[PDB]
TrEMBL record, chain A:
Name this protein carries in UniProt: Type IV pilus biogenesis ATPase PilB
Residue window of the full protein shown: 179 to 568 of 568
Residues that span the membrane, as ranges: none
Keyword Transcription regulation: no
GO biological process, one term: pilus assembly
UniProtKB/TrEMBL annotation, chain C:
Family (UniProt): Belongs to the GSP E family.
Organism per entry: Geobacter sulfurreducens (strain ATCC 51573 / DSM 12127 / PCA)
Gene Ontology biological process: pilus assembly
Residues reported in the UniProt entry to bind Zn(2+): 276, 279, 311, 314
Any one GO molecular-function label of the UniProt entry: metal ion binding
Gene Ontology cellular component list: cytoplasm; plasma membrane
Compartments in which it is found: Cytoplasm
Keywords from the UniProt entry: ATP-binding, Cytoplasm, Metal-binding, Nucleotide-binding, Zinc
Residues of the full protein shown: 180 to 568 of 568
Bacterial type II secretion system protein E domain: residues covered: 202-216
Protein name: Type IV pilus biogenesis ATPase PilB
Protein's gene: pilB
Length: 385, 383, 386
C-alpha cells in the first residue's frame, strides 16, 4: 500500500532501544492502530500509524522472522537479529488483523554479574556456593516479572564453561546464549518441560535449567535429576522461600527427596526505584519503621525518600526497578524441620534464626541505602511478625 | 392487520416492555407471541393462524435468510432504525418458530458498581481483580449475567498500561484497546492454542471465555500461577462446587489452592416494581426456614408488586443479582489440600462471613428490592 | 554429501581413537561445534562449517533409522559400527537453532550372564528359574530402557542354551552375538518385522523363542499363541510394574484367558545405584520415614541405613555400582482368577503382595537393609506400596 515501510519498521525497533524499552506491542483495531513500548513494566502509546500500512508492517516483520505471510488466522513465533541486536517475535490473530509483540534482547542492558544485581553480601555468598556445587537443585522462586530468570542467566554465565553440557527448557526461550543448548517449549506437539527434561537425561548433561516447575510430573523428574548427579536450576511461584518447601510437598513429592536434593531456595521480587531527579524526603515516624520491622537502634539513621513526580520519571516518581532477595540455603537445621513435618511459619523462623534475611529485610536495606520508597517496600513484601 | 406493521409492532412493543427475547410460536391450533421479561415468558399476542407463514417469512426477509428453505433451521440478524436483534428460525412440526434476542449494547452496564454487589462482596471482588496474578472464576448458568460481571472486570482493568488479551467462543463485546481472539477449533484455534500464544507475547491480564475441559483448565491455572491475571467462567451451582468441579476435571489440588484468587457465583432474580410496591405479610416461620435469623425476622419488611402499568402487571421491573463471592482464603486452601468435599467448604466459607446466594438474596429482600417468592424461586436453602 | 559423510566418519572415528565416552554435536545461531567427553570432561574437538549443521545431523538420523522429516521434537535411536565393535545410543534434541545430536558409548564390558549374580533375591530367583525351565509358556521381563531387562533376558537364555533346544530370537537390534542361538535382526524397511520373523519361527521346528519387545498387538497376539502351542516365549515390555503389564496386554486386545493360560511369569525391574564400599557411612534415618516407606515397624529400628560420604573411588558421588530391584510375579491361580473376573491393576498388586510377591519398593528396602543402597535411592527409583 506504500513504499517507505522499511524506514518505518526500522524506526520502531531502533527507537525502542534508545528508549530502553523491554517490549514492543503493535496493535491493530477496527478504527485505530497503535504501537506501545513497555518501559519498566508500563506500556506507553508511542505511535498511531495509518491503517493502510498495517499489513505492510506485519508482513515486513514476518519476512524478517521467516513467518508465513499467508497465515493470518493462527499464531506464529520467530526471531529477528539486526545490526548485533536480536528480537523475539510473537504474532497473534487479533479480531482486526495480527498483533505483533517484539521483546528487546540487548545484552548491553542486561546484567549478568551477580555482584551488580543488588544481592546483599551475606546472602550472595550462599547463592554462589550452591550454583558452584557439582550437583543438587537450586530454586529461584517468584512470579513472572520478578527478575528470577536474570538470577538464573547470571548463574549460567558464571558456569558456562566449555567443559560442561548446559541444557535449557523455557517457555519461551528469551536470550540466545552461546554454548548453551536452549529448547523452547511447544505443548501442542508434546514438547513439555517433562519431555525435554526426560530427553535431557538422554543427552549426557551436566547442568539443566528448567523455566518453571508447574506440575508434579516435572517436579519429580527435576528432583531425581538433581539426585543422579546433575545441577538442576528452576523456578516456582511461591510467596517466600520457606513456602517453597511445602509447595513441593503439596505437589506430592516425598519430603526426604526434597531435603537431600535441594541445595538452595532463592526468593525475590522487583520494586520500583526512586527517580534520582524529583527525589524528596518523607518524614516517616520511627514507630512506623519499627512496626514495619526496622531494628529500633537503626530506626533514626533511616532517611526515607520518595519521588514527587517529574518529567524524567513520567510523573511516576520511579525509574528503574530494584530487587528484594531472600537466599535460604538448605542448612542442616532446615532439613530436620522438613522431616519433622514442619509448617511454613516454623521454617521461616529458624531461617531467620540462622541469619537468613527475608525479602522485607532486604527491602529495608534498599530503603536505607535510599533507592526505594517506604510504600514500595510495604506494597511488595510482607512484614515478618 | 397489516403484516409489515405488525412485525414492527411486535418488535417495538418488546422494546417498550424492556423484553430480552421474543418468541413467535406456531402450533397445530394456536399461534402466539411471547416476550421474555425479567427471565419469565408471558403470552403477549394470539394472532390469527393465517398469518403464521406471513410473519415468519417477513422476518426472514428482514434478516436476509433463505426464504425457499422452511424445513431446516436458519440464523441471522436484524438492525432497525431507532437496536439490533439476533434471529433464529426452527422448523417446528406446524410451521417455523422464530426467536429474536435483543442486543442492547448501548444501554449495557460495564461497571461493577452498577451490578448490585453487596459492599463486603464487592470489596473482595475488587481486591482480587487488582491483584497482580491469580485466577478469578465467575460461575453461574446461562442467563445469569456472569458474562456481564466478567466484562465489568475487564472494563475496570482496561488501562493503557496493561496488555489485556482475550479468547472467546464467540466474541460478545467488541472492545477497543483489548486484543480479542475469536476461537476457531476447526482450524486448530482452541482456547488452549490461543492461551499458549498469550504467554509468549508479554501479557498482563488474560480473559478466557469459559473453562470447559481439563486441557483448558490445567493450562489456564498454570498460567495464572506463573504470575499472570486470568479471568474465566464455569457452569457450576455455587462457588464451592467450582473447586470440586476443577478437581473432578483432573486438576492437581495445589494449583486450585495456590492459583485461584476468587470464585464468584450468581443468579438473577426479578426486582419488584417501584410503583405498585406493597408490603406482604410473610409468616415469620417462613423467614426462619428460609434462613433468616429469628432475632431479625420481625424487622424484615417483605414486599410484593400489586400489578400496575409500568410493571406490565407482572409486579416486577428489571432484575437484581444474588452474588456469592468466595475469596480463596487461607482456611479454604487448607480444606482443598485435606481433600474436603463441597459441603464442608461451603460451611467454612459461611463461617468466615462469605454470604451464600440465599443469604445475599435475603439481603435484597430486606432492602425491599425482591419478593420473598423470588428468593425461594431462584435459590436453595443452606442445609 | 561428499564432505559431510567424510566429516561424519571423522567425528565417529576420532571419537573411537580418542577413547571418548560421549559425542556432542552442537549447533548454535552463528557457531557449530563437536565436543567429545573424555574421562567425564568435554573438549572442543571440531568447528565444522556452519552450512553443514543441518546436513550432518540428518545423515546421522538416517544412520539411526530416525524420522528426518521431524526436526521439532526429540528422538532417540541406536548405531552399530562394527570392528574386530562399538555401538552407540543416539539422542536428538530440538535446540532453538536446529537439532542437537548426542552419542553415548555402550561397550557392555562388564556383562553378567549368571542369574545368581544379578542381585535377584533367593525367593525371587526360584520363581524365575521355575518359569523359564517350564517346557512352554510366556515369560515377560518388563521395565524401562536402561533397567537391565535385556540383561536379565539374555542371562535366562544362557541357562537354557543347551544343544538339545532350538532357540531362535528376533531383536531390533540384536545385542549380543550368541553361539547356538539363532538370532534374527529386524529390518522394518524390507518387511522383516517381529511378526514376520515370529511367523517363520513356527515353520522352524522351534523350542525357545525370544522377542526383543512386544510393542504391538500383531506381535503380542502371535507370541501368546506360540506359548500355548508348546513353545517357550520370552519378551519385554515397557510398563511400570508387573501387575500393570497384565492390563497392558489386555488393553492391546488380548483375550484374558489367553493371558491367564499362556503367561507363566512377569518380571519387572529397575536399577539403583550401589553405595561405595569405601566411603560408606551409616546414616541415622528417622524411623517414621521407614514405616511410611513401607517397612513393617516391628523390624524397622534394626535397619542400619548407609550412604556414601564421597571418596576417590566413587568420584565423590557416594556411589559405585548398580543394584537391581526386582518384582517377579508368577501367574498363580489367584491372579489367574482375578484376570478372568476383570480385576484392575491395584487388586492384582494387592493379591500378589498377599501371596508374598515382593514389590520393587519392598525388594529395594531389602537391599537397603543389606546395606548396598541408600534410602534416597530407594525413594528415587521405586513407588510406595499404598
Ligand atoms: Zn522523577
Ligand atoms: Zn408495577
Ligand atoms: Zn566412595
Amino acid at each position: 500500500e506504500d513504499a517507505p515501510v522499511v524506514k518505518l519498521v526500522n524506526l520502531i525497533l531502533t527507537d525502542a532501544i534508545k528508549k530502553k524499552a523491554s517490549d514492543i506491542h503493535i496493535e491493530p483495531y477496527e478504527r485505530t492502530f497503535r504501537v506501545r513500548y513497555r518501559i519498566d513494566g508500563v506500556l506507553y502509546e508511542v505511535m498511531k500509524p495509518p491503517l493502510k500500512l498495517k499489513n505492510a508492517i506485519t508482513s515486513r516483520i514476518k519476512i524478517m522472522a521467516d513467518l508465513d505471510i499467508a497465515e493470518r488466522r493462527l499464531p506464529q513465533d520467530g526471531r529477528i537479529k539486526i545490526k548485533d541486536m536480536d528480537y523475539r517475535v510473537s504474532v497473534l490473530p487479533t479480531l482486526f488483523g495480527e498483533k505483533v509483540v517484539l521483546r528487546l534482547l540487548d545484552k548491553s542492558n542486561l546484567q549478568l554479574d551477580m555482584t551488580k544485581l543488588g544481592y546483599e553480601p551475606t546472602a550472595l555468598s550462599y547463592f554462589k556456593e550452591a550454583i558452584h556445587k557439582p550437583f543438587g537443585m537450586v530454586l529461584v522462586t517468584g512470579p513472572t516479572g520478578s527478575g528470577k530468570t536474570v538470577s538464573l542467566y547470571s548463574a549460567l554465565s558464571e558456569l558456562n564453561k566449555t567443559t560442561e553440557n548446559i541444557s535449557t527448557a523455557e517457555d519461551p526461550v528469551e536470550f540466545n546464549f552461546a554454548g548453551i543448548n536452549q529448547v523452547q517449549m511447544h505443548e501442542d506437539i508434546g514438547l513439555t518441560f517433562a519431555a525435554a527434561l526426560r530427553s535431557f537425561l538422554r543427552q549426557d548433561p551436566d547442568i539443566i535449567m528448567i523455566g518453571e516447575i508447574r506440575d508434579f510430573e516435572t517436579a519429580e523428574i527435576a528432583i531425581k535429576a538433581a539426585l543422579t548427579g546433575h545441577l538442576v536450576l528452576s523456578t516456582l511461584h511461591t510467596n517466600d522461600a520457606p513456602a517453597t518447601i511445602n509447595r513441593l510437598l503439596n505437589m506430592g513429592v516425598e519430603p526426604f527427596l526434597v531435603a537431600s536434593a535441594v541445595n538452595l531456595i532463592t526468593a525475590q521480587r522487583l520494586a520500583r526505584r526512586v527517580c534520582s531527579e524529583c527525589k524528596a524526603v518523607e518524614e516517616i515516624p520511627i514507630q512506623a519503621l519499627i512496626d514495619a520491622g526496622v531494628p529500633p537502634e537503626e530506626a533514626p539513621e533511616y532517611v526515607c525518600f520518595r519521588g514527587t513526580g517529574c518529567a524524567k520519571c513520567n510523573n511516576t516518581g520511579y525509574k528503574g526497578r530494584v530487587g528484594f532477595y531472600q537466599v535460604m540455603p538448605m542448612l542442616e537445621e532446615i532439613r530436620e524441620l522438613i522431616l519433622n513435618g514442619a509448617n511454613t511459619a516454623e521454617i521461616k523462623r529458624e531461617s531467620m534464626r540462622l541469619g537468613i534475611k527475608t525479602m522485607r529485610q532486604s527491602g529495608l536495606t534498599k530503603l536505607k541505602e535510599g533507592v526505594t520508597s517506604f510504600e514500595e517496600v510495604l506494597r511488595v513484601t510482607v512484614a515478618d511478625d
